[PDB]
Symmetry: D2
């Protein structure tokens, strides 16, 4: 009859998969383990590739309204501007995580995607059986493992993998823009503010709209003050005095967390009727701001390959073969950028760095040449 | 049988119409009066609306490759920077006219649009008859008058109209970028360089790619030196000394022309099976850089309305009703900006000014909110 | 016995003469027509030449304390910075008129210069007789006519002369610095802010110290709004919006005057025992800011020539021959700068323009080479 | 009869002493150990205090002609401008060492100071006997020990002292300005270019005139590349790429030396008829650029105290009591600035830092208030 998909995970990968499948006439249920649908991480960047996914999902309008494209992506080293990049017109956007989340959830609900909260996938069978923590066993023609770095859809089946959790991380927050209080400057810009002296402290400054500012405060875990939550106001104001008004607001946040970086890589993304998408398959370093971009492109591309009249099993194999190398290359380059601190030099959004961003999943070609 | 369209005019409107119709399965012939297909005017700006038309035409890739999006659209008054605008991420692009022309011609030929040069439409009959200067009479289900401000498709039928040719104009040229020679600055920007003192002289500085620069040199016709062709090098270097390397190259051009501004407005754009598109119907002041944008949106939109299963006559009426107000408003605002010299103030690409640019003809909604 | 000098006028020329003579052992009385000692004109610039006079007068310490040397002398045309000049280290200073006045008066009193207020010289006899408006006739070995452009010491004797009072002028005021309120900029600079468009309005911005700002607001007399006192706040804020906080304070001043420019030139500066100094002899255009500088150098130089053991009559002739050409050249060049609006171009403090400033009256050589 | 002075040392202290004494009618001979009169160290800064000494010596004109006052004293940290200081008009000047040397030598010769080269003082007797390495014993009313950090006039007598030679130092050179090749910037400025990351390397950039640039390249002795002579071009270009044209010229200099810092401090500067001046008495860290300034003020002040009608012995005691505290304070503060790297912060030419510079030795008061 009507093809049935069960999607595990209510993040950006899972919502993208669910919407894309529902648009193509699948009956879709999405399962979120948490008690409510929420997106963590404060803010997020999307690029052309991700914006094209949103267009394909019919969720672009709600995203662009109330989000921001900075006039330029600027990099500082020790308070000296070292580069300003605009990517030869390649579209990009900054927004709060909740803003993107809301657009996707609203679109899924409008389409009639069934959503279950407090519903955790704990086992998946490649023949198309999904077991929830409740003991309910669902039969489906497709099972999507969009359940994050700790994917149980993945681990119940067994996928050869390398995972890494870093010792280091960052504190991500949303604070008021305080634009007037920042005084003279280019405060609508993205500004990646690097320092190695007198200490290793960095802030990625990311306006989301006229009201909200996304800050990432990065210091090594071995730095007891820089890695402290709620933030140690003094050590941040000392090295970023021009952001004092915003940092004062940041210091009020008792919910602040020092989140560590984490990566996953698998030899394969499929097993029978099961496809792994997003961080379940390819969590990467955030240097190129493509973790969700690739997750969304991959989820959308999955729906495309399922429209070819092949068996689900064959479509899934074809899907990975077609789409995975863009992600493998992006993940590898992101990890290398992170390790070499490449972004600190500025002008590092090269044609190769922008490969993932340049991909248009709708037409399946690369656009916005560099 | 197969629906037949005859298109008069090989400009951007005519090529857009021809491609769009051919993609929808029309048999299409395009007639260009001139001995060869060529686009005059040196350079051109397109925005989101026009870029979306190109996407819809399958001609976007060839356009983006080898064209330019400046990091910002900057305005100067008396050499003082008064604004820098990036339109909240709204896509835009600068290119040579030949670059856009070539992309459209190549796409039309790839699709099998028949093209006749030295073929001038001199009379059109609303019942679907087109007479060429050769005396050949063609029967068609649709006749597109894309034959410019002096449209004979229009005037052979008789459309109530207001036309205006200004006394004033400008000299448009392509010269080498000479980027190194320009020294320190932001020479990838669009820079609209206004002056009223010591004389009324203005240059719109518009990089097209890494090799080619589009310059518009604007001075009143009453100024014998500023309006002179080939350019009077001294009076331009005097007020724009920072562009001397480029102006020296400009002064070599014996083909330079002082072209006067011209507008057309009609009470109606249709008569039976005849539709008027582009400058034939709505030539406007270039302040908002939307003359071709609107022409292309209108031509593309025409093809859309012809896919509704209506008679051609009814589709044409529906087309104008649907699409004309965007153009009427843009034309009116452009004319008002020109007359009031509004752009000289900077920060004048307001939400209202950007209305046409914001329109997405593919989805028929407004995007890129301001 | 002790040589007796009577000095007419309590301006900078008269006070300089009185101090310089008293230091050399003259008995000196100074006569000021006005009811009190006061200096009008809001603020004033001095340069190396004038500062050296102050040193020679023992009045330099009180002047430098509480006055200002800007980091640079900056010129704007239509809000674009066209030059920044620092004169190769040549000393200069800005102060309120009252500040300079007070230093000179205090020094004169410390030395025992007799000062009479409400004492107007109405006739001077070259044999050494001075008649006051009171009818008192004083005998002296030297009479100094330091009584301004309308000198009665001069006109009672009869000196061939050319005088000119311009139709145009300016409004000079002292207002609070409002430095914080001016926001980002270089607000300790001298900034000469020229415009010809949209109207002829100019402000010379001249900080005097951390508290007081000297403004000169210049517009043609034919401009009813720009030349209005108290100032027409709107027309000044319109063209100088960045000075709004200071202009708001300026608009409160009910004492503001539109003062017209005035020049004097004489074929000779001496007659018997009478010497004319300052505006009585050589009032000039203020372009080079040397009116008082030359007056002070000339007054000081007069005292020098009187130490040569010559008759007073011979010393006076020698004095004019020695010192007058520096003033003649400065006056001529200042007038030419004013008429040609030369300062509007920036970088016009050339070696020739700075000749007067470069003169050291103490050592009688030119210093601070350019 | 005529008072006789013998001066040991042909540096700035010795020449200043010799000129000042000769002007007051002393018979003066100066003894320089080296085979010729020469000044080492590439370039030098003087301030108001030193410029006033030059005025008092009649050597100011030859110094100002062909030397430079930068528009501002600028400080960079990691290529970010952190301060621009102009010292509220306090006069200052940069020149090559040879330029200052030549002015002083020419003045000494014009006055008839006797100069002996290859003449080394090896012993001084407080009763007024000077023994040269030749075995010649000279009798004098005054012996000036201006013979540098290794003063034998000092050490032959025995003065309790603390001396320190640092392990660290710098490479001082004169190179062509290469102003055009430096491109856009403020290349007439003094720019103190600090870095601690990626390595400790600093350049003090000091224009001397339109032709000559004084560079100080500072790196720790423990850095084998940064401290290398002739300069290791690559490691300097890497951290100061904007100076590449000048550094290329610097790398040609086979005479370049890595000179270590050195200080001296004594409990007393006098013994009978012997006075110690300059580095013989008070060599200091160069942070405040006052080593020669203080030497010159002290030498000039010595001549002043010898005009009081006291015995030479009493005049010398009075001299030290009067003048030494300015030097003690300057030396102490300079050393503290050096150790704390205070100048790296910018805005450190405070009123206290500028105390020595503010002293006017001619009038014996402090001028140019801050
Ligand atoms: C610091 C940082 C900055 C980043 N910045 C960007 C950026 O700017 N742009 C960008 O594109 N990407 C960015 N990323 C990466 C991006 O956050 C992720 O790649 C993306 O959120 C992955 O989404 P997902 O849906 O695969 O997984 P997740 O977001 O982890 O979502 C899975 C959802 O899984 C639910 N769940 C888990 N287990 C189960 C289960 N067993 N059953 C049912 N539900 C389950 C999880 O609770 C959750 O609701 C960044 C990442 C980090 C760490
Ligand atoms: C100075 C200036 C700057 C501009 N800048 C921009 C800009 O930046 N961006 C933008 O979008 N627009 C811009 N425009 C407007 C843009 O140039 C026009 O709106 C656009 O080129 C109109 O195209 P069209 O096809 O309608 O007409 P045309 O370009 O005039 O083309 C019609 C073609 O008609 C052929 N022809 C004429 N008569 C016949 C006939 N009887 N039979 C067959 N063929 C015929 C003409 O020869 C020609 O080949 C600008 C205009 C001006 C004047
Ligand atoms: C707009 C403007 C800006 C200027 N800016 C500068 C500047 O920046 N730097 C600079 O150096 N110069 C400047 N000047 C010029 C400077 O103001 C004059 O040259 C200077 O004040 C002349 O001084 P004085 O003593 O000769 O005459 P005055 O200042 O006119 O003084 C004479 C004194 O004469 C008293 N008096 C008059 N008649 C008699 C009498 N019969 N008997 C007794 N007393 C009498 C007058 O009342 C008064 O008290 C400027 C001038 C103008 C107009
Ligand atoms: C890196 C550096 C930068 C500096 N920058 C500045 C600056 O910008 N401004 C400033 O004011 N100061 C500066 N100084 C300090 C300044 O260089 C010295 O304080 C000054 O040159 C000391 O001069 P002097 O005459 O006392 O001694 P010296 O310059 O050492 O001269 C004494 C002369 O002594 C001769 N001599 C030695 N022994 C005998 C003898 N026994 N008999 C006869 N002759 C003898 C020496 O050969 C020489 O000719 C700087 C110093 C250093 C190290």
């Amino acid at each position: 009859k009507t093809r049935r998909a069960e999607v595990a995970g209510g993040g950006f990968a899972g919502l993208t998969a669910a919407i894309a499948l529902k648009q193509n006439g699948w009956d879709v249920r999405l399962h979120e383990k948490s008690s409510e649908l929420r997106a963590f991480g404060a803010g997020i960047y999307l690029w052309h590739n991700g914006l094209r996914v949103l267009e394909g999902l019919g969720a672009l309008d709600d995203v662009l309204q109330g989000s921001h494209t900075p006039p330029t992506y600027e990099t500082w080293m020790h308070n000296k501007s070292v580069s300003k990049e605009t990517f030869n017109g390649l579209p990009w956007r900054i927004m709060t995580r909740s803003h993107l989340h809301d657009a996707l959830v609203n679109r899924a609900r409008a389409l009639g995607v069934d959503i279950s909260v407090n519903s955790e996938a704990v086992a998946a069978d490649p023949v198309g059986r999904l077991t929830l923590q409740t003991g309910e066993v669902l039969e489906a023609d497709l099972i999507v493992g969009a359940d994050g770095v700790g994917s149980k859809v993945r681990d119940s089946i067994g996928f050869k993998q390398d995972r890494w959790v870093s010792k280091d991380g960052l504190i991500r927050l949303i604070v008021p823009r305080m634009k007037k209080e920042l005084g003279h400057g280019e405060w609508d810009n993205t500004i990646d503010m690097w320092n190695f002296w007198p200490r290793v402290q960095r802030i990625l400054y990311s306006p989301c709209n006229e009201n909200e500012l996304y800050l990432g405060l990065m210091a090594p875990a071995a730095d007891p003050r820089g890695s402290s939550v709620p933030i140690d106001l003094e050590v941040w104001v000392e090295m970023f005095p021009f952001l004092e008004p915003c940092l004062i607001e940041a210091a009020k946040l008792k919910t602040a967390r020092y989140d560590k970086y984490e990566t996953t890589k698998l030899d394969s993304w499929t097993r029978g009727k099961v496809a792994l998408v997003g961080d379940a398959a390819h969590a990467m370093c955030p240097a190129l701001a493509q973790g969700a971009g690739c997750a969304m492109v991959n989820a959308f591309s999955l729906s495309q390959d399922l429209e070819e009249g092949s068996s689900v099993e064959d479509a899934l194999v074809a899907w990975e073969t077609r789409i995975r190398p863009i992600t493998d290359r992006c993940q590898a380059l992101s990890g290398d950028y992170a390790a070499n601190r490449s972004l600190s030099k500025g002008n590092m959004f090269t044609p190769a760095a922008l490969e993932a961003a340049r991909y248009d999943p709708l037409r399946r070609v690369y656009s916005w040449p560099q």
